[PDB]
Amino acid sequence: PNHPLWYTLCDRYGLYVVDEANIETHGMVPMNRLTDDPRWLPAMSERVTRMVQRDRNHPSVIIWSLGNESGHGANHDALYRWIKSVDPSRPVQYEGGGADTTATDIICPMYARVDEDQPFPAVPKWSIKKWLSLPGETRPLILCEYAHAMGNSLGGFAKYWQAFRQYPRLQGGFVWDWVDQSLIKYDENGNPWSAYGGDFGDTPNDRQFCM
Amino acid sequence: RLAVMVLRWSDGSYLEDQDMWRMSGIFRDVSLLHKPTTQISDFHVATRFNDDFSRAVLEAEVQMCGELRDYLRVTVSLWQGETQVASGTAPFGGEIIDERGGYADRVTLRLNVENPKLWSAEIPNLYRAVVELHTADGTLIEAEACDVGFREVRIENGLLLLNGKPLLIRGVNRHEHHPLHGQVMDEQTMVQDILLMKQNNFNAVRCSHY
Ligand SMILES: *[C@@H]1C[C@@H](O)[C@@H](O)[C@@H](CO)O1
Ligand SMILES: [Mg+2]
Ligand code: NA
Ligand code: NA
User: Which family does the entry's similarity section mention (chain B)?
Assistant: First the structure.
């Protein structure tokens, strides 16, 4: 959840908002070790429920998100249903555990390509065009992350937009991402420079992957 | 002496506007069939399966014309080559279907078949079903027959399945056309077409358009 003023500004300037619970357990093995554990359901519920209680009157918020990269666990299904019960006015989405689980109203993969399948075991990234028509699938597809804008990037951005326009149920996506997470450091002469992972003696680190 | 006046054009022509040569005449077989007064007038064969196709029920509905009699029976026998795998015998008289009763001139035989050999384009396993119309005490009145292929065709969850598996149709449309004989078909040409199709990895044909 963002600083409260963000929603006020989005209300007034006009931007559709995905409001997302502060739950990411990416580093667990497997990713859902905590989110499938009922002992962690209380801590998780509060991150979802208090978000909804705070932000539910903002018109700019059109979709709730259960968090990010926390696999798919039974705790997601419970909280998915909690929101659906308290606020039927907004769809609920969540990408974890394969992007099309029982805990999401929207097929919301990250970095599924336009035409090319990536058939990972358990959590494949289908071609977005193919994903829509998988046997029994009926939901809209909006990528929670796509077109990874790292450095000299956005090759093939037009391919996504051609597909979005051609396919009714391909309803766009959220680019990753808006702003480089570089930090300012100063040299011996007081001249500013842009710094990334590892530039603060921080270790282990992941270098420029924050930009 | 038979006399046949064949019209090239009729009101039927309005329903026969296929993209093809417009011809006319007696272009398929003519035959004489002799049936007894008491006769098999129709029969339907169905094959239904359990979840893994390890068990089947062959259901054969048989209809007769002629005078109904208590001594009349139908036997449906199922053969795999020279081996009879199943058989059932029953007198006529279907189940009650409504307030007026049932079909007294029909009977349905149900035959259990364990581990049936399934039909497909990949392996066209066939059984022979023989339908015997007879007196109870053993006098055959007539027999009819057909080849039987145990297979299930269904659409489930958006997929066309054959015996539980999704088909990939390698198909072609085929007209009944011969450069010399026009729209008259013969065994040799048919067989030639089938061998060529299969040799070129086709598994399916559409009877365009008749
Ligand atoms: C589809 C119908 C068929 O009869 C042909 O007319 C074909 C075009 O050659 O289109
Ligand atoms: Mg036509
Ligand atoms: Na679209
Ligand atoms: Na990153």
Answer: Belongs to the glycosyl hydrolase 2 family.
Q: How was this structure determined?
A: X-ray
Flag whether residue B160 sits within 8 Å of chain A, measured between CB atoms: no
Interface test with A, best of B154, B155, B157, B167 (most A CBs within 10 A): B157
> Three-state secondary structure along chain A?
CCCHHHHHHHHHHCCCEEEECCCCCCCCCCCCCCCCCHHHHHHHHHHHHHHHHHHCCCCCEEEEECCCCCCCCHHHHHHHHHHHHHCCCCCEECCCCCCCCCCCCCECCECCCCCCCECCCCCCECCHHHHHCCCCCCCCEEEEEECCCCCCCCCCHHHHHHHHHHCCCEEEEEECCCCCCCEEEECCCCCEEEECCCCCCCCCCCHHHHC
B18 CA closest ligand 1 atom index: 4
Residue whose Cα lies nearest atom 4 of ligand 1: it is B19
Total structural domains in chain A?
Answer: 1
Residue A146 sits in a domain whose CATH number is 3.20.20.80
A155 vs B: CB within 8 A: no
